[PDB]
Write a protein that binds this ligand. Structure first.
Ligand code: HEM
Ligand code: HEM
Ligand code: HEM
Ligand code: HEM
Ligand SMILES: [K+]
Ligand SMILES: [K+]
Ligand SMILES: [K+]
Ligand SMILES: [Xe]
Ligand SMILES: [Xe]
Ligand SMILES: [Xe]
Ligand SMILES: [Xe]
Ligand SMILES: [Xe]
Ligand SMILES: [Xe]
Ligand SMILES: [Xe]
Ligand SMILES: [Xe]
Ligand SMILES: [Xe]
Ligand SMILES: [Xe]
Ligand SMILES: [Xe]
Ligand SMILES: [Xe]
Ligand SMILES: [Xe]
Ligand SMILES: [Xe]
Ligand SMILES: [Xe]
Lengths: 146, 141, 141, 146
């Protein structure tokens, strides 16, 4: 991943406007609605039967909060994504058995959610910066797979 | 697979896009070229400047095709036949790129019509653009 | 689209595979797990070492499904319906992985068919496996 | 690119056995047959009407020899594929306008060709090593795109 200084600036500036819990719940719920095979890990989370049930499910939203909290913290480490996510990579491979393609689907949902939430502010160059970031995060989370 | 609820959702959402369709088609290309630079390999001949006539023309044509597909969602292979021939025989755009444009159209719609871009509508639009893309690549080999 | 020439090539190649289909299916999985380690995420309940009987069992099941698909090449969605349900609703294998297994089955076929894996037969087999994959992912959403 | 020592040894051992011109013509012809939209870059190459015409076309074979010769040269530089392919990367972007997905298609076809030619000797671990390499070469060829 190679962010220009101005792309790093744009990422950081938009993110300062984000309610991480809110965006996390929206993005993770939309992941499960739009790409329902991602529900495979969440048989224990209760009602996933309709889009409204998924979006409103407390367990889904708690998962989104945890996931996007970790994503948020990683944005302080744009220079070292592989290192910052290495231990989560190993957990996702070794214990959680999560196909990294799920991370790429989440990245694209997150981009859509940022567009949805930010409107005018989510300009084509801001999107391009965030596309680099979500790709870099997914790549970092995939890095320790074996 | 595209359901009749999906069909309803796409008709409603694209109907709401209305007269903005060409604008949004152009913006989807603009977004794609910046987010996914390799897609510019298919447009070495264009002025890709913001607001160019060539990008706006491409966006209007693509928007018209999408309008035709939305109006004919149970007969899309027929509706898009000339375009599936054009892409298979001449343009020869690698199928991977249709995913990239589709994503950029979703982003464009989310940015412009957030009230309409509900989770269900997002899912239906994604399925619909995947269907359109399948049709457009169906004659490649 | 599966053309009569493609169907003919597929039937000829898979007829040659004959009773080795299960062995080749197992080898395709073995190749996939090594070349594309993320695919192992779907088999945490398996011994995935060379010669594993669990991999042999999986390869036999998939080979048999493919034999059935070949026998029903003109009626494939119905033939594969139970498997489409199973992959969509329970196994929930991300669609990208079907590409990976399809490539590894081509490699396996190539490694065992010096005469028969001609360029034309390679092309038809790739088309066929893409069509099987499309059917198997058609009910995911 | 990071290769295990089993992987790099497997690549170099197999490659010393390869007839590069022959494999290059075979892989490049199969690329144009199996993925015929790739013919878009070869309008001037003459008859590409049927699989036999493509495979027998002297210009296709000459292109495959050039391409796989450059691939072969790069195998001496497995530790710095980005640097070894930078000039060709910029050429393919700026002059030839080649979508890098084409490089991935060619890598896949090359793997199939090596399996076809070597049979049982193209074992699952040798294939895995080659998959790493073709991915690394495609990534290196894509690196200078902008
Ligand atoms: C931005 C990308 C992601 C990040 C940063 C991330 C981060 C995390 C974190 C911090 C945890 C908690 C780990 C712990 O308890 O020690 C976790 C758990 C988990 N993640 Fe990920 N995750 C990501 C994407 C995904 C995706 C896309 C999926 C699957 C669709 C997934 C599936 C899981 C599962 C199944 C758990 C365990 C949940 C539980 O036990 O309740 N993750 N993730
Ligand atoms: C929703 C998917 C798409 C639709 C509905 C679509 C539709 C169209 C239409 C209506 C035209 C104009 C044809 C004419 O002037 O007769 C066109 C041209 C073209 N399209 Fe596609 N297209 C799609 C995806 C793509 C993608 C993904 C790319 C490349 C990244 C692409 C590249 C081209 C190119 C290069 C031209 C010719 C432009 C020119 O020289 O004027 N298209 N397409
Ligand atoms: C040509 C494509 C494929 C076909 C025809 C196919 C077919 C099958 C069949 C026939 C079964 C056994 C069902 C039963 O026992 O009732 C099965 C199970 C399974 N398949 Fe698929 N499959 C394909 C691709 C994939 C891919 C790409 C993956 C993952 C990378 C996958 C993962 C699984 C898993 C995890 C099971 C369950 C195995 C077990 O629990 O024993 N399949 N498949
Ligand atoms: C991935 C491995 C590849 C390598 C190492 C490579 C290398 C080369 C080399 C050495 C040349 C000759 C440059 C010159 O003499 O000026 C060339 C030309 C060219 N390559 Fe690539 N190439 C690769 C893949 C591809 C693919 C997959 C395509 C498109 C399907 C492609 C399209 C072209 C084109 C259009 C030319 C000019 C051909 C002509 O008209 O003579 N290359 N490449
Ligand atoms: K995308
Ligand atoms: K997908
Ligand atoms: K030559
Ligand atoms: Xe999230
Ligand atoms: Xe991500
Ligand atoms: Xe578009
Ligand atoms: Xe354009
Ligand atoms: Xe649409
Ligand atoms: Xe699109
Ligand atoms: Xe919308
Ligand atoms: Xe074969
Ligand atoms: Xe097989
Ligand atoms: Xe298989
Ligand atoms: Xe297995
Ligand atoms: Xe097959
Ligand atoms: Xe397969
Ligand atoms: Xe080649
Ligand atoms: Xe390659």
């Amino acid at each position: 991943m190679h962010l220009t200084p101005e792309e790093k600036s744009a990422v950081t500036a938009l993110w300062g406007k984000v309610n991480v819990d809110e965006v996390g719940g929206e993005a993770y719920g939309r992941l499960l609605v739009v790409y329902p095979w991602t529900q495979r890990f969440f048989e224990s989370f209760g009602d996933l039967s309709t889009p409204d049930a998924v979006m409103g499910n407390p367990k889904v939203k708690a998962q989104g909060k945890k996931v996007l909290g970790a994503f948020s913290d990683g944005l302080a480490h744009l220079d070292n994504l592989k290192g910052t996510f290495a231990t989560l990579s190993e957990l996702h491979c070794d214990k959680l058995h999560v196909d990294p393609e799920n991370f790429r689907l989440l990245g694209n949902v997150l981009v859509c959610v940022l567009a949805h939430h930010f409107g005018k502010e989510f300009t084509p160059p801001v999107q391009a910066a965030y596309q680099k970031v979500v790709a870099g995060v997914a790549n970092a989370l995939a890095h320790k797979y074996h | 697979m595209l359901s009749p609820a999906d069909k309803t959702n796409v008709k409603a959402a694209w109907g709401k896009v209305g007269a903005h369709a060409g604008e949004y088609g152009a913006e989807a290309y603009e977004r794609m070229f910046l987010s996914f630079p390799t897609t510019k390999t298919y447009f070495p001949h264009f002025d890709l400047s913001h607001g160019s006539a060539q990008v706006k023309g491409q966006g209007k044509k693509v928007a018209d095709a999408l309008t035709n597909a939305v109006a004919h969602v149970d007969d899309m292979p027929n509706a898009l036949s000339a375009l599936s021939d054009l892409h298979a025989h001449k343009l020869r755009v690698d199928p991977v790129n249709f995913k990239l444009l589709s994503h950029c159209l979703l982003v464009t719609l989310a940015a412009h019509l957030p009230a309409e871009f509900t989770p269900a509508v997002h899912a239906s639009l994604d399925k619909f653009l995947a269907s359109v893309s399948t049709v457009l690549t169906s004659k490649y080999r």
